[PDB]
Amino acid sequence: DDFAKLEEQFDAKLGIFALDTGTNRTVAYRPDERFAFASTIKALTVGVLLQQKSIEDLNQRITYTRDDLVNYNPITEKHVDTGMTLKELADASLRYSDNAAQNLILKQIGGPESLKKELRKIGDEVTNPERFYPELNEVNPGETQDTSTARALVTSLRAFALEDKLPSEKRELLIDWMKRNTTGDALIRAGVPDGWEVADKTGAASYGTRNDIAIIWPPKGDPVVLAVLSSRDKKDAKYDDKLIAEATKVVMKALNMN
Ligand SMILES: CC1=C(C(=O)O)N[C@@H]([C@@H](C=O)NC(=O)Cc2cccs2)SC1
């Protein structure tokens, strides 16, 4: 009941799945409960992009205009005049959660419907991409569009980053981007001792949805893959990062890593 206690303290619903890739030991709490995936989808999106292109092909330059910019464009809003390469867009999407970058990448891989088809091909029957930004943040309780589960996001992040859905050079690019994420310092990273390498992707959406998916490398040992998803009862609810940090501390204890 440490997970239950956190739902009580933060008045939120929590979805946890963690897999120690070294022992196949698992920590779960509502692991199959749907949540809006929010920006966590960006990680899986770069997965599919990497699978479909050579590394050299990421050097294709994408021209775009103000009309491709949406509600949060911290990198893309600076380079309308020059455009950005696919590699630069992958960096913006993963490290800054640039929503226009995600939309431009989605367009290059054939849109939300194409992304869905490529996720089913890697064995993910759960994650349901259907819309672009900004609409994908808008998910009402009980709806399944743009939702996933903690178990499915772990299984899929692991498949791309650590297994055989990508060749080693592409896994390395994806892991490196996620390792240098700038948006995650208050979430999973804040539940993990300084010095352990962490790769993560955050998200936030309606109903106070607040998510983080990560790979954690304990000093030595095989890594852990973790999803912490959360949501609240009201549409305009605020979230609290500290719920994710605290849930992460619980996982690390339950796995005897701290
Ligand atoms: C703060 C934030 C993140 C993140 O932390 O990863 N990613 C982008 C996106 C996906 O989560 N969120 C939105 O665009 C919708 C919003 C929810 C709360 C503020 S904006 S923009 C909002």
Side-chain angles (χ1 to χ4, degrees):
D1 97 292
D2 260 359
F3 290 126
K5 188 159 301 183
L6 288 177
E7 287 185 317
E8 183 175 8
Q9 291 175 358
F10 290 93
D11 182 40
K13 191 182 70 182
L14 205 52
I16 314 286
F17 191 72
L19 165 69
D20 182 312
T21 69
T23 57
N24 293 136
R25 283 197 202 93
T26 239
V27 176
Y29 186 86
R30 305 194 197 286
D32 299 309
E33 178 73 13
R34 274 178 184 280
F35 296 79
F37 49 54
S39 289
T40 63
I41 197 62
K42 291 173 177 164
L44 302 193
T45 302
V46 164
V48 169
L49 174 70
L50 285 168
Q51 190 179 69
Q52 294 296 144
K53 309 291 197 169
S54 79
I55 288 176
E56 187 61 50
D57 283 331
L58 304 176
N59 291 337
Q60 173 178 184
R61 177 173 301 277
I62 308 308
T63 293
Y64 62 93
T65 79
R66 171 176 297 141
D67 281 350
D68 296 291
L69 267 38
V70 288
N71 278 1
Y72 184 65
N73 321 295
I75 307 309
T76 50
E77 80 187 7
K78 299 303 163 18
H79 297 115
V80 174
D81 292 340
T82 61
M84 289 173 60
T85 66
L86 290 169
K87 186 170 167 194
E88 291 173 341
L89 291 164
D91 179 84
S93 175
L94 290 183
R95 299 212 308 113
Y96 292 90
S97 205
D98 196 303
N99 290 342
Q102 163 67 2
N103 279 357
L104 266 336
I105 289 160
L106 253 198
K107 283 161 148 97
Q108 291 302 322
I109 68 175
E113 206 171 299
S114 180
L115 173 64
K116 179 181 305 205
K117 177 201 214 201
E118 296 313 314
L119 295 177
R120 309 284 176 255
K121 278 173 37 180
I122 69 126
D124 187 344
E125 295 287 352
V126 171
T127 307
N128 299 324
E130 269 148 45
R131 298 170 288 176
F132 293 89
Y133 277 101
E135 294 81 3
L136 70 83
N137 285 139
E138 303 303 322
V139 178
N140 294 302
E143 291 171 356
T144 68
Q145 85 259 226
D146 300 299
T147 61
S148 191
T149 67
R151 181 190 319 268
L153 294 173
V154 163
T155 299
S156 287
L157 178 53
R158 187 197 187 187
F160 281 114
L162 300 177
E163 297 179 305
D164 285 306
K165 304 306 173 186
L166 294 171
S168 62
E169 294 200 345
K170 295 186 184 168
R171 284 176 226 163
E172 289 322 307
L173 278 173
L174 175 64
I175 283 159
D176 174 51
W177 283 322
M178 296 189 57
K179 277 185 177 168
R180 301 184 291 111
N181 186 24
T182 75
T183 65
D185 295 354
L187 292 83
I188 288 169
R189 285 175 201 265
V192 166
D194 274 23
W196 298 21
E197 287 209 65
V198 177
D200 88 290
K201 180 69 197 82
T202 59
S206 59
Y207 289 89
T209 295
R210 191 47 163 165
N211 305 334
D212 201 14
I213 62 175
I215 308 160
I216 303 155
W217 286 266
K220 54 100 163 276
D222 280 327
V224 174
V225 188
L226 165 68
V228 181
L229 311 180
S230 72
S231 72
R232 309 195 55 198
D233 279 2
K234 293 201 233 285
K235 180 166 151 161
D236 62 354
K238 306 292 187 197
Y239 55 79
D240 199 332
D241 292 344
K242 187 71 66 136
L243 165 66
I244 310 300
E246 292 302 329
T248 300
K249 286 180 185 169
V250 177
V251 170
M252 295 315 268
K253 282 218 293 124
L255 286 184
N256 299 105
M257 294 193 172
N258 201 59

Tab-separated table of all heavy atoms in Angstrom, residues 127-178:
chain	number	residue	atom	x	y	z
A	127	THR	N	-1.304	0.649	-27.339
A	127	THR	CA	-1.101	2.103	-27.574
A	127	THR	C	-1.900	2.544	-28.808
A	127	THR	O	-1.752	1.915	-29.878
A	127	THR	CB	0.388	2.420	-27.767
A	127	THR	OG1	1.068	1.866	-26.639
A	127	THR	CG2	0.660	3.894	-27.937
A	128	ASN	N	-2.746	3.565	-28.656
A	128	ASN	CA	-3.696	3.955	-29.733
A	128	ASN	C	-3.482	5.400	-30.184
A	128	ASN	O	-4.329	6.255	-29.955
A	128	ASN	CB	-5.159	3.793	-29.320
A	128	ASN	CG	-5.573	2.372	-28.969
A	128	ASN	OD1	-5.105	1.396	-29.570
A	128	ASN	ND2	-6.512	2.243	-28.027
A	129	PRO	N	-2.463	5.667	-31.015
A	129	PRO	CA	-2.313	6.998	-31.589
A	129	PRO	C	-3.411	7.273	-32.628
A	129	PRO	O	-3.665	6.442	-33.440
A	129	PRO	CB	-0.950	6.997	-32.279
A	129	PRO	CG	-0.447	5.577	-32.213
A	129	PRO	CD	-1.459	4.714	-31.493
A	130	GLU	N	-4.040	8.440	-32.542
A	130	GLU	CA	-5.117	8.802	-33.491
A	130	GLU	C	-5.018	10.279	-33.869
A	130	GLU	O	-5.422	10.594	-35.002
A	130	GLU	CB	-6.473	8.402	-32.914
A	130	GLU	CG	-6.878	6.998	-33.325
A	130	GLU	CD	-7.704	6.245	-32.298
A	130	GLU	OE1	-8.634	6.843	-31.747
A	130	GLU	OE2	-7.423	5.044	-32.069
A	131	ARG	N	-4.484	11.151	-33.016
A	131	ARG	CA	-4.531	12.586	-33.392
A	131	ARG	C	-3.181	13.274	-33.342
A	131	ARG	O	-2.201	12.706	-32.816
A	131	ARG	CB	-5.508	13.330	-32.485
A	131	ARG	CG	-6.936	12.811	-32.604
A	131	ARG	CD	-7.803	13.413	-31.520
A	131	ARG	NE	-7.476	12.856	-30.209
A	131	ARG	CZ	-8.011	13.253	-29.053
A	131	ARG	NH1	-8.906	14.228	-29.034
A	131	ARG	NH2	-7.652	12.678	-27.916
A	132	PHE	N	-3.147	14.474	-33.909
A	132	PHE	CA	-1.974	15.360	-33.800
A	132	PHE	C	-2.092	16.199	-32.531
A	132	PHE	O	-3.156	16.181	-31.811
A	132	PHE	CB	-1.823	16.235	-35.051
A	132	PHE	CG	-1.488	15.476	-36.308
A	132	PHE	CD1	-2.498	14.982	-37.117
A	132	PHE	CD2	-0.170	15.275	-36.694
A	132	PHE	CE1	-2.185	14.314	-38.285
A	132	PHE	CE2	0.143	14.579	-37.848
A	132	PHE	CZ	-0.873	14.115	-38.655
A	133	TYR	N	-1.021	16.932	-32.252
A	133	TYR	CA	-1.077	18.041	-31.267
A	133	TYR	C	-1.827	19.172	-31.951
A	133	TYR	O	-1.568	19.415	-33.123
A	133	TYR	CB	0.281	18.614	-30.849
A	133	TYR	CG	0.915	17.788	-29.768
A	133	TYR	CD1	1.918	16.875	-30.052
A	133	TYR	CD2	0.417	17.840	-28.481
A	133	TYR	CE1	2.434	16.047	-29.065
A	133	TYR	CE2	0.909	17.015	-27.490
A	133	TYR	CZ	1.923	16.122	-27.787
A	133	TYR	OH	2.457	15.332	-26.822
A	134	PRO	N	-2.627	19.989	-31.227
A	134	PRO	CA	-2.860	19.870	-29.777
A	134	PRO	C	-3.947	18.886	-29.278
A	134	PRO	O	-3.987	18.566	-28.078
A	134	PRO	CB	-3.253	21.319	-29.421
A	134	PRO	CG	-3.934	21.859	-30.660
A	134	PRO	CD	-3.255	21.176	-31.826
A	135	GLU	N	-4.788	18.376	-30.178
A	135	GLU	CA	-5.993	17.561	-29.836
A	135	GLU	C	-5.645	16.304	-29.041
A	135	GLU	O	-6.457	15.912	-28.186
A	135	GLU	CB	-6.764	17.126	-31.077
A	135	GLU	CG	-7.399	18.296	-31.824
A	135	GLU	CD	-6.446	19.061	-32.737
A	135	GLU	OE1	-5.251	18.646	-32.855
A	135	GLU	OE2	-6.887	20.080	-33.339
A	136	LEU	N	-4.499	15.686	-29.275
A	136	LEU	CA	-4.220	14.410	-28.576
A	136	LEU	C	-4.160	14.580	-27.055
A	136	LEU	O	-4.286	13.561	-26.366
A	136	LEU	CB	-2.949	13.751	-29.111
A	136	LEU	CG	-1.572	14.355	-28.837
A	136	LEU	CD1	-0.996	13.971	-27.474
A	136	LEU	CD2	-0.642	13.803	-29.889
A	137	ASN	N	-3.961	15.784	-26.531
A	137	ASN	CA	-3.927	15.943	-25.053
A	137	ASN	C	-5.332	15.779	-24.456
A	137	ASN	O	-5.429	15.423	-23.254
A	137	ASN	CB	-3.288	17.263	-24.641
A	137	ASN	CG	-1.784	17.224	-24.800
A	137	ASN	OD1	-1.187	18.200	-25.255
A	137	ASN	ND2	-1.164	16.094	-24.470
A	138	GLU	N	-6.363	15.990	-25.268
A	138	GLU	CA	-7.781	16.042	-24.834
A	138	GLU	C	-8.367	14.633	-24.808
A	138	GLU	O	-8.854	14.175	-25.860
A	138	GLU	CB	-8.592	16.863	-25.832
A	138	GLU	CG	-8.069	18.268	-26.014
A	138	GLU	CD	-8.029	19.018	-24.693
A	138	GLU	OE1	-8.969	18.841	-23.869
A	138	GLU	OE2	-7.052	19.738	-24.464
A	139	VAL	N	-8.288	13.962	-23.670
A	139	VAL	CA	-8.831	12.583	-23.544
A	139	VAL	C	-9.716	12.576	-22.316
A	139	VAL	O	-9.208	12.896	-21.236
A	139	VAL	CB	-7.759	11.477	-23.435
A	139	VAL	CG1	-8.403	10.101	-23.259
A	139	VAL	CG2	-6.818	11.455	-24.635
A	140	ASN	N	-10.981	12.216	-22.491
A	140	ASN	CA	-11.946	12.160	-21.368
A	140	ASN	C	-11.948	10.769	-20.790
A	140	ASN	O	-11.672	9.804	-21.497
A	140	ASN	CB	-13.363	12.508	-21.793
A	140	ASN	CG	-13.450	13.949	-22.234
A	140	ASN	OD1	-13.136	14.851	-21.459
A	140	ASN	ND2	-13.840	14.170	-23.480
A	141	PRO	N	-12.176	10.648	-19.471
A	141	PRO	CA	-12.262	9.337	-18.853
A	141	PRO	C	-13.103	8.344	-19.653
A	141	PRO	O	-14.120	8.710	-20.206
A	141	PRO	CB	-12.856	9.661	-17.481
A	141	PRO	CG	-12.151	10.946	-17.137
A	141	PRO	CD	-12.064	11.708	-18.457
A	142	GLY	N	-12.591	7.118	-19.735
A	142	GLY	CA	-13.271	6.023	-20.452
A	142	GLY	C	-12.956	5.970	-21.940
A	142	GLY	O	-13.205	4.916	-22.516
A	143	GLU	N	-12.448	7.045	-22.547
A	143	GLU	CA	-12.091	7.073	-23.995
A	143	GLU	C	-10.727	6.403	-24.208
A	143	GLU	O	-9.894	6.450	-23.287
A	143	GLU	CB	-12.015	8.502	-24.512
A	143	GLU	CG	-13.346	9.226	-24.596
A	143	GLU	CD	-13.178	10.708	-24.907
A	143	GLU	OE1	-12.008	11.197	-24.983
A	143	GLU	OE2	-14.207	11.383	-25.030
A	144	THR	N	-10.502	5.791	-25.371
A	144	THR	CA	-9.244	5.041	-25.641
A	144	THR	C	-8.355	5.728	-26.672
A	144	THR	O	-7.183	5.307	-26.796
A	144	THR	CB	-9.482	3.595	-26.074
A	144	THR	OG1	-10.086	3.555	-27.369
A	144	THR	CG2	-10.340	2.888	-25.061
A	145	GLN	N	-8.867	6.707	-27.412
A	145	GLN	CA	-7.982	7.405	-28.376
A	145	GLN	C	-6.844	8.094	-27.599
A	145	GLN	O	-7.065	8.654	-26.532
A	145	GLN	CB	-8.742	8.316	-29.337
A	145	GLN	CG	-9.033	9.704	-28.800
A	145	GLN	CD	-10.462	9.815	-28.329
A	145	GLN	OE1	-11.169	10.783	-28.635
A	145	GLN	NE2	-10.902	8.806	-27.595
A	146	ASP	N	-5.630	7.925	-28.139
A	146	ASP	CA	-4.366	8.526	-27.637
A	146	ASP	C	-4.092	8.084	-26.202
A	146	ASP	O	-3.595	8.887	-25.426
A	146	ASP	CB	-4.397	10.045	-27.765
A	146	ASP	CG	-4.580	10.463	-29.213
A	146	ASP	OD1	-3.691	10.101	-30.037
A	146	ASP	OD2	-5.669	11.031	-29.534
A	147	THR	N	-4.370	6.829	-25.899
A	147	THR	CA	-4.106	6.263	-24.574
A	147	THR	C	-3.190	5.078	-24.734
A	147	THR	O	-3.065	4.519	-25.859
A	147	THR	CB	-5.369	5.795	-23.864
A	147	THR	OG1	-5.969	4.773	-24.653
A	147	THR	CG2	-6.343	6.929	-23.633
A	148	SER	N	-2.548	4.747	-23.628
A	148	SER	CA	-1.826	3.471	-23.504
A	148	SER	C	-1.888	3.032	-22.045
A	148	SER	O	-2.739	3.552	-21.309
A	148	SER	CB	-0.429	3.598	-24.029
A	148	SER	OG	0.159	2.312	-24.143
A	149	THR	N	-1.066	2.059	-21.678
A	149	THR	CA	-0.995	1.540	-20.298
A	149	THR	C	0.465	1.522	-19.897
A	149	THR	O	1.326	1.545	-20.811
A	149	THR	CB	-1.576	0.132	-20.139
A	149	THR	OG1	-0.794	-0.863	-20.816
A	149	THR	CG2	-3.005	0.069	-20.633
A	150	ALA	N	0.726	1.445	-18.589
A	150	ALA	CA	2.116	1.427	-18.105
A	150	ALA	C	2.808	0.186	-18.671
A	150	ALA	O	3.954	0.306	-19.112
A	150	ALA	CB	2.175	1.462	-16.600
A	151	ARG	N	2.150	-0.981	-18.673
A	151	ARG	CA	2.816	-2.216	-19.158
A	151	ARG	C	3.183	-2.054	-20.640
A	151	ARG	O	4.257	-2.477	-21.085
A	151	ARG	CB	1.931	-3.452	-18.916
A	151	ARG	CG	2.567	-4.750	-19.376
A	151	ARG	CD	1.685	-5.973	-19.388
A	151	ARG	NE	0.806	-6.062	-18.239
A	151	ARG	CZ	1.094	-6.687	-17.107
A	151	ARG	NH1	2.260	-7.293	-16.948
A	151	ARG	NH2	0.201	-6.707	-16.131
A	152	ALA	N	2.293	-1.530	-21.438
A	152	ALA	CA	2.525	-1.463	-22.894
A	152	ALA	C	3.624	-0.456	-23.189
A	152	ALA	O	4.493	-0.773	-24.020
A	152	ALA	CB	1.286	-1.084	-23.623
A	153	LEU	N	3.585	0.724	-22.549
A	153	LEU	CA	4.668	1.717	-22.797
A	153	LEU	C	6.039	1.108	-22.412
A	153	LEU	O	6.998	1.303	-23.145
A	153	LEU	CB	4.377	3.033	-22.067
A	153	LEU	CG	3.144	3.815	-22.554
A	153	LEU	CD1	2.849	5.021	-21.665
A	153	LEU	CD2	3.291	4.245	-24.008
A	154	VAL	N	6.173	0.452	-21.261
A	154	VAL	CA	7.444	-0.251	-20.907
A	154	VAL	C	7.833	-1.234	-22.012
A	154	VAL	O	8.987	-1.275	-22.395
A	154	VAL	CB	7.305	-0.967	-19.562
A	154	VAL	CG1	8.379	-2.020	-19.343
A	154	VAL	CG2	7.298	0.067	-18.467
A	155	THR	N	6.911	-2.098	-22.430
A	155	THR	CA	7.218	-3.225	-23.358
A	155	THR	C	7.764	-2.638	-24.679
A	155	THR	O	8.794	-3.119	-25.261
A	155	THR	CB	5.918	-4.024	-23.520
A	155	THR	OG1	5.577	-4.488	-22.210
A	155	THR	CG2	5.991	-5.165	-24.507
A	156	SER	N	7.076	-1.610	-25.148
A	156	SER	CA	7.414	-0.897	-26.403
A	156	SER	C	8.711	-0.079	-26.238
A	156	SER	O	9.512	-0.063	-27.152
A	156	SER	CB	6.295	-0.028	-26.859
A	156	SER	OG	5.225	-0.801	-27.376
A	157	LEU	N	8.896	0.662	-25.145
A	157	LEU	CA	10.175	1.419	-24.974
A	157	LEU	C	11.309	0.418	-24.913
A	157	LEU	O	12.342	0.636	-25.548
A	157	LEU	CB	10.162	2.239	-23.693
A	157	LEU	CG	11.436	3.019	-23.378
A	157	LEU	CD1	11.871	3.908	-24.540
A	157	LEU	CD2	11.235	3.859	-22.112
A	158	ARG	N	11.131	-0.661	-24.173
A	158	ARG	CA	12.187	-1.699	-24.122
A	158	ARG	C	12.469	-2.257	-25.524
A	158	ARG	O	13.678	-2.445	-25.880
A	158	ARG	CB	11.760	-2.830	-23.189
A	158	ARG	CG	12.842	-3.869	-22.938
A	158	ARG	CD	12.299	-5.155	-22.360
A	158	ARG	NE	13.383	-6.040	-21.991
A	158	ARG	CZ	13.253	-7.292	-21.582
A	158	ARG	NH1	12.072	-7.859	-21.503
A	158	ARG	NH2	14.325	-7.981	-21.264
A	159	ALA	N	11.427	-2.563	-26.293
A	159	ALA	CA	11.588	-3.214	-27.610
A	159	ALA	C	12.489	-2.334	-28.494
A	159	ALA	O	13.353	-2.857	-29.204
A	159	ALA	CB	10.243	-3.468	-28.244
A	160	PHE	N	12.292	-1.017	-28.468
A	160	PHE	CA	13.071	-0.081	-29.320
A	160	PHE	C	14.462	0.138	-28.754
A	160	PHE	O	15.432	0.112	-29.492
A	160	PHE	CB	12.380	1.276	-29.457
A	160	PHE	CG	11.248	1.270	-30.451
A	160	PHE	CD1	9.948	1.456	-30.034
A	160	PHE	CD2	11.483	1.023	-31.791
A	160	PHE	CE1	8.899	1.388	-30.939
A	160	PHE	CE2	10.436	0.964	-32.697
A	160	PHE	CZ	9.142	1.162	-32.273
A	161	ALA	N	14.548	0.453	-27.482
A	161	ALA	CA	15.796	0.934	-26.863
A	161	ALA	C	16.779	-0.193	-26.580
A	161	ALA	O	18.002	0.087	-26.641
A	161	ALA	CB	15.480	1.598	-25.577
A	162	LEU	N	16.271	-1.354	-26.140
A	162	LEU	CA	17.122	-2.438	-25.592
A	162	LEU	C	17.051	-3.742	-26.373
A	162	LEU	O	17.981	-4.512	-26.232
A	162	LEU	CB	16.741	-2.704	-24.143
A	162	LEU	CG	16.917	-1.504	-23.239
A	162	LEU	CD1	16.443	-1.857	-21.835
A	162	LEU	CD2	18.369	-1.055	-23.240
A	163	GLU	N	16.000	-4.010	-27.138
A	163	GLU	CA	15.864	-5.328	-27.803
A	163	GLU	C	16.270	-5.212	-29.286
A	163	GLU	O	17.329	-4.623	-29.557
A	163	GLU	CB	14.481	-5.888	-27.489
A	163	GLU	CG	14.308	-6.124	-25.988
A	163	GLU	CD	12.950	-6.662	-25.546
A	163	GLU	OE1	11.916	-6.038	-25.876
A	163	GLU	OE2	12.930	-7.697	-24.853
A	164	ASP	N	15.464	-5.739	-30.214
A	164	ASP	CA	15.874	-5.942	-31.622
A	164	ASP	C	14.900	-5.282	-32.595
A	164	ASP	O	14.847	-5.711	-33.778
A	164	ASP	CB	16.007	-7.435	-31.905
A	164	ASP	CG	17.272	-7.966	-31.284
A	164	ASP	OD1	18.340	-7.378	-31.575
A	164	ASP	OD2	17.179	-8.913	-30.483
A	165	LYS	N	14.179	-4.257	-32.135
A	165	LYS	CA	13.352	-3.430	-33.046
A	165	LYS	C	14.236	-2.382	-33.718
A	165	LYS	O	13.781	-1.772	-34.696
A	165	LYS	CB	12.160	-2.836	-32.295
A	165	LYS	CG	11.297	-3.878	-31.609
A	165	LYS	CD	10.762	-5.024	-32.471
A	165	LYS	CE	10.053	-6.073	-31.614
A	165	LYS	NZ	9.670	-7.252	-32.425
A	166	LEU	N	15.453	-2.172	-33.215
A	166	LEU	CA	16.422	-1.294	-33.896
A	166	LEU	C	17.796	-1.915	-33.846
A	166	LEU	O	18.100	-2.699	-32.936
A	166	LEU	CB	16.528	0.069	-33.222
A	166	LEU	CG	15.306	0.971	-33.278
A	166	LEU	CD1	15.521	2.165	-32.366
A	166	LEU	CD2	15.033	1.398	-34.724
A	167	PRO	N	18.637	-1.533	-34.826
A	167	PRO	CA	20.045	-1.917	-34.773
A	167	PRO	C	20.801	-1.083	-33.725
A	167	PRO	O	20.341	0.011	-33.405
A	167	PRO	CB	20.559	-1.595	-36.176
A	167	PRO	CG	19.649	-0.466	-36.671
A	167	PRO	CD	18.295	-0.775	-36.051
A	168	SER	N	21.960	-1.565	-33.278
A	168	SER	CA	22.675	-0.929	-32.137
A	168	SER	C	22.918	0.570	-32.406
A	168	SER	O	22.716	1.341	-31.468
A	168	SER	CB	23.942	-1.659	-31.696
A	168	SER	OG	24.920	-1.709	-32.719
A	169	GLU	N	23.329	0.989	-33.600
A	169	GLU	CA	23.667	2.428	-33.775
A	169	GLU	C	22.441	3.332	-33.551
A	169	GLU	O	22.585	4.473	-33.070
A	169	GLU	CB	24.227	2.694	-35.163
A	169	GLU	CG	25.564	2.036	-35.413
A	169	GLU	CD	26.326	2.664	-36.570
A	169	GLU	OE1	25.691	3.420	-37.358
A	169	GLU	OE2	27.557	2.406	-36.685
A	170	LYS	N	21.263	2.868	-33.938
A	170	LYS	CA	19.999	3.628	-33.774
A	170	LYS	C	19.526	3.579	-32.319
A	170	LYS	O	19.048	4.598	-31.837
A	170	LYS	CB	18.949	3.074	-34.741
A	170	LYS	CG	19.342	3.290	-36.188
A	170	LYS	CD	18.284	2.888	-37.154
A	170	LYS	CE	18.764	3.039	-38.564
A	170	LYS	NZ	17.796	2.368	-39.447
A	171	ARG	N	19.623	2.440	-31.639
A	171	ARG	CA	19.306	2.372	-30.193
A	171	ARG	C	20.116	3.430	-29.461
A	171	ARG	O	19.570	4.077	-28.538
A	171	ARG	CB	19.732	1.053	-29.563
A	171	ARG	CG	18.831	-0.117	-29.896
A	171	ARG	CD	19.425	-1.371	-29.298
A	171	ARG	NE	19.391	-2.410	-30.307
A	171	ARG	CZ	20.098	-3.530	-30.278
A	171	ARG	NH1	20.925	-3.784	-29.277
A	171	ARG	NH2	19.985	-4.378	-31.276
A	172	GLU	N	21.383	3.554	-29.847
A	172	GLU	CA	22.311	4.499	-29.191
A	172	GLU	C	21.827	5.945	-29.359
A	172	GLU	O	21.897	6.734	-28.381
A	172	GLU	CB	23.747	4.257	-29.666
A	172	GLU	CG	24.305	2.952	-29.122
A	172	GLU	CD	23.900	2.632	-27.671
A	172	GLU	OE1	24.103	3.499	-26.777
A	172	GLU	OE2	23.345	1.515	-27.422
A	173	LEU	N	21.407	6.327	-30.551
A	173	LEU	CA	20.855	7.694	-30.769
A	173	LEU	C	19.642	7.959	-29.886
A	173	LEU	O	19.599	9.000	-29.241
A	173	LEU	CB	20.405	7.831	-32.219
A	173	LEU	CG	21.496	8.156	-33.212
A	173	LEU	CD1	20.919	8.098	-34.617
A	173	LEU	CD2	22.090	9.517	-32.888
A	174	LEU	N	18.720	6.995	-29.834
A	174	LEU	CA	17.471	7.119	-29.055
A	174	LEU	C	17.808	7.234	-27.578
A	174	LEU	O	17.254	8.089	-26.904
A	174	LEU	CB	16.604	5.885	-29.300
A	174	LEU	CG	15.319	5.776	-28.494
A	174	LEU	CD1	14.424	6.929	-28.888
A	174	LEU	CD2	14.667	4.461	-28.856
A	175	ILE	N	18.709	6.390	-27.104
A	175	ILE	CA	19.042	6.378	-25.658
A	175	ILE	C	19.755	7.676	-25.295
A	175	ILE	O	19.518	8.254	-24.221
A	175	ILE	CB	19.845	5.108	-25.339
A	175	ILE	CG1	18.884	3.925	-25.282
A	175	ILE	CG2	20.626	5.272	-24.040
A	175	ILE	CD1	19.529	2.578	-25.485
A	176	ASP	N	20.627	8.122	-26.178
A	176	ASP	CA	21.413	9.339	-25.928
A	176	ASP	C	20.447	10.525	-25.819
A	176	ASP	O	20.581	11.280	-24.858
A	176	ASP	CB	22.509	9.535	-26.969
A	176	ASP	CG	23.200	10.864	-26.765
A	176	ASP	OD1	23.634	11.159	-25.595
A	176	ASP	OD2	23.166	11.657	-27.685
A	177	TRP	N	19.529	10.697	-26.770
A	177	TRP	CA	18.508	11.779	-26.710
A	177	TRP	C	17.761	11.719	-25.385
A	177	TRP	O	17.730	12.694	-24.674
A	177	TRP	CB	17.533	11.718	-27.882
A	177	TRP	CG	18.104	12.241	-29.150
A	177	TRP	CD1	18.933	13.310	-29.319
A	177	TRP	CD2	17.883	11.691	-30.445
A	177	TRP	NE1	19.228	13.474	-30.640
A	177	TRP	CE2	18.618	12.483	-31.349
A	177	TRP	CE3	17.181	10.585	-30.917
A	177	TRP	CZ2	18.648	12.221	-32.710
A	177	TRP	CZ3	17.195	10.343	-32.278
A	177	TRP	CH2	17.916	11.145	-33.158
A	178	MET	N	17.260	10.553	-25.023
A	178	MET	CA	16.433	10.424	-23.809
A	178	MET	C	17.275	10.643	-22.540
A	178	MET	O	16.770	11.222	-21.571
A	178	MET	CB	15.808	9.034	-23.797
A	178	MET	CG	14.835	8.802	-24.968
A	178	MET	SD	13.887	7.273	-24.817
A	178	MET	CE	13.039	7.388	-23.237
